[PDB]
Amino acid sequence: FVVPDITTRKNVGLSHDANDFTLPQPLDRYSAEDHATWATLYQRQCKLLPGRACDEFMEGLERLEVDADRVPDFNKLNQKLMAATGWKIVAVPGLIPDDVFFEHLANRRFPVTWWLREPHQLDYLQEPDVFHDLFGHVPLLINPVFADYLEAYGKGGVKAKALGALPMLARLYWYTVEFGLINTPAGMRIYGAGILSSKSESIYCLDSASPNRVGFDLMRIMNTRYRIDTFQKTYFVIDSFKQLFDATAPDFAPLYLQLADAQPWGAGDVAPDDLVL
Numbered sequence: 488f489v490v491p492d493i494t495t496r497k498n499v500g501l502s503h504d505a506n507d508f509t510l511p512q513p514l515d516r517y518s519a520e521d522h523a524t525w526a527t528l529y530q531r532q533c534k535l536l537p538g539r540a541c542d543e544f545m546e547g548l549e550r551l552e553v554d555a556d557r558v559p560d561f562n563k564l565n566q567k568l569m570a571a572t573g574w575k576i577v578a579v580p581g582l583i584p585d586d587v588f589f590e591h592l593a594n595r596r597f598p599v600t601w602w603l604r605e606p607h608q609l610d611y612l613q614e615p616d617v618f619h620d621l622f623g624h625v626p627l628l629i630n631p632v633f634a635d636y637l638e639a640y641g642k643g644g645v646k647a648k649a650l651g652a653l654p655m656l657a658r659l660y661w662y663t664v665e666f667g668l669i670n671t672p673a674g675m676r677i678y679g680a681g682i683l684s685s686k687s688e689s690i691y692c693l694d695s696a697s698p699n700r701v702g703f704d705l706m707r708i709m710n711t712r713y714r715i716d717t718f719q720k721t722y723f724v725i726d727s728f729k730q731l732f733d734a735t736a737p738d739f740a741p742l743y744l745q746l747a748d749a750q751p752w753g754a755g756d757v758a759p760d761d762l763v764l
């Protein structure tokens with residue numbers, strides 16, 4: 488049997504822009520159970536993350552006044568985010584067209600899936616939800632270097648799309664925004680949103696001998712496959728957000744064409760030039 492998925496169920500009776508896929512955050516659809524699920528997730532992650540998340544992430548939660556006890560009101564958070572870095576968040580139904588996603592980032596708008604997983608799905612949801620998108624991704628938007636990296640990434644979508652290279656950018660996003668690590672004198676820390684919202688990938692990614700921790704290298708990353716339904720086999724480690732921003736400022740066009748004819752690395756491979764940490 489085919490049954491409707493969670494995105495379809497949650498969005499019953501609601502609409503989205505056929506173009507930019509933005510809707511007003513539907514506050515009246517959050518049930519008491521939803522605010523409780525949020526509070527449970529928020530509490531779980533805030534217990535787990537000290538000494539694991541990078542300091543900028545934890546300070547962003549506080550500076551943005553991300554609610555501990557209910558799903559946040561996006562308008563309220565936006566007042567703080569706008570004053571910090573001129574960003575805002577926009578509600579979307581769930582996954583959106585790539586060109587829309589890029590155009591949002593290019594214009595300093597971060598798309599956030601509005602709805603929340605059900606309490607039976609507390610431990611893990613495959614689809615992004617509001618907890619993953621808001622709690623995992625938004626705190627670092629108050630950091631001006633990281634926010635400029637996202638805007639720059641957004642602006643690159645047009646060139647990538649024109650050259651059939653969106654998957655090569657998607658790999659860079661996955662291995663930075665979603666699953667990145669950042670080294671510090673106090674030890675390795677986490678900045679990827681997919682780790683920061685996870686029940687236990689923050690533990691594996693720092694504590695396990697199993698994954699590879701490889702120094703960031705733009706061409707390697709854009710030539711590396713990833714999988715979405717398993718802990719990462721490789722994490723890429725930056726030294727600073729200023730590195731994402733700088734390492735990723737050259738013209739990507741000749742890089743895409745060189746990659747377009749290469750065979751990519753598997754998700755668990757170690758490449759001959761990898762600085763392995």
Ligand SMILES: N[C@@H](Cc1ccccc1)C(=O)O
Binds near residue numbers: 642646738
């Ligand atoms: N420098 C990239 C744009 C980009 C910036 C930052 C991250 C990813 C892509 C280009 O030439 O298109």
Ligand SMILES: [Co+2]
Binds near residue numbers: 503
């Ligand atoms: Co639709």
Ligand SMILES: [Co+2]
Binds near residue numbers: 620623
């Ligand atoms: Co994400």
